[PDB]
């Protein structure tokens, strides 16, 4: 959860140089990002997801 004591940091990306595109080639591109846990990853206290919800028993 959001706690200012356990702050994480900031992740940013910047243009190092400039995109170099030849004539007759689109100059607007897209990047994609994937995230994965490392070998040292670990979690430690079962709880209930905030997202799941219900107003009354289904069917």
């Amino acid at each position: 959860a959001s706690d200012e004591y356990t702050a994480g940091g900031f992740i940013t990306c910047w243009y190092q140089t400039n995109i170099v595109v030849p004539a007759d080639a689109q100059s607007s591109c897209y990047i994609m990002c994937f995230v994965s846990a490392c070998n040292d990853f670990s979690v430690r206290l079962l709880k209930d997801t905030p997202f799941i919800s219900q107003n009354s028993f289904f069917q």
Partner: protein, 268 residues
């Protein structure tokens, strides 16, 4: 035990651990010591609470219904299904096929209803919970002959005691439970479509064995399911949308996530 970090130093080689192609779909097995200098620290952390068992091995209410000692509704019935609630359903839906034993627990609570009958001195109520396997004689009335429970299993509980609990083995004609089904009841691709076709767990009934008092009383039974000896296969993504029905996966379309100000915003 989780893997400890390894100490490394500077490097000017031709080894390119960071550069890779995700077109293959192979997740890169890089560690922090590959793209920076690291210290060697022993890691004593443990993935003991992340095992499938510890994850699904908790009691969760899957239904509750109310029956009275007078009037019309004298007994209660429930068609066994784990899709009635949202929390346990969403925890179970992480996997395509699951095999698990079940620890059932029942909580029964009574309440006096508003009336006008004078001189009310009740006695202790006893409850009977009868399970009928599919194909059995379902009770048609509260004083039905079927309540004999010769072959059928039954549990009798007197109010004021500890809640009843029993253990049920892996019941299935298949080799594992199916959380999802992509087929039809008939071979002609018509009729019931979905996990409803596979479902066939029978019906559960409940009644007051005695009236107890001359005044009205309403009882409510709560069903709790704790999975144990869990084995699971083929994981799948968690339900982004909210559930709507118990017999089907029908949903209302929703966005992937929640919107922020711009692509350079550190706050929600």
């Amino acid at each position: 035990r989780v893997a400890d970090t390894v100490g490394t130093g500077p490097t000017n080689s031709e080894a390119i651990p960071a550069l890779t192609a995700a077109e293959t779909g192979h997740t890169s097995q890089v560690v922090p010591g590959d793209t920076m200098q690291t210290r060697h620290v022993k890691n004593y952390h443990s993935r003991s609470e992340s095992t499938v068992e510890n994850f699904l091995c908790r009691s969760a209410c899957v239904y509750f219904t109310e029956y009275k000692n007078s009037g019309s509704k004298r007994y209660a019935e429930w068609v066994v299904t784990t899709r009635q609630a949202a929390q346990l359903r969403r925890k179970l839906e992480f996997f395509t096929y699951i095999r698990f034993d079940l620890e059932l627990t029942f909580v029964i609570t009574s309440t006096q209803q508003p009336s006008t009958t004078q001189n009310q001195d009740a006695q202790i109520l006893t409850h009977q919970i009868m399970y009928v396997p599919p194909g059995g004689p379902v009770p048609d009335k509260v004083d039905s002959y079927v309540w004999q429970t010769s072959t059928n299993p039954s549990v009798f509980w007197t109010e004021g005691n500890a809640p009843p609990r029993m253990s049920i083995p892996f019941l299935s004609i298949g080799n594992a439970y199916s959380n999802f089904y992509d087929g039809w009841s008939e071979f002609s691709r018509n009729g019931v479509y979905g996990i409803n076709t596979l479902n066939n767990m029978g019906t559960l009934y409940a009644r007051h064995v005695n009236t107890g008092s001359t005044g009205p009383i309403k009882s409510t039974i709560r069903i709790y399911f704790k999975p144990k000896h869990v084995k699971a296969w083929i994981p799948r993504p968690p339900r982004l949308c909210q559930y709507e029905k118990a017999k089907n996966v029908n949903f209302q379309p929703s966005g992937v996530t929640t919107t922020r100000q711009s692509i350079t915003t550190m706050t929600n």
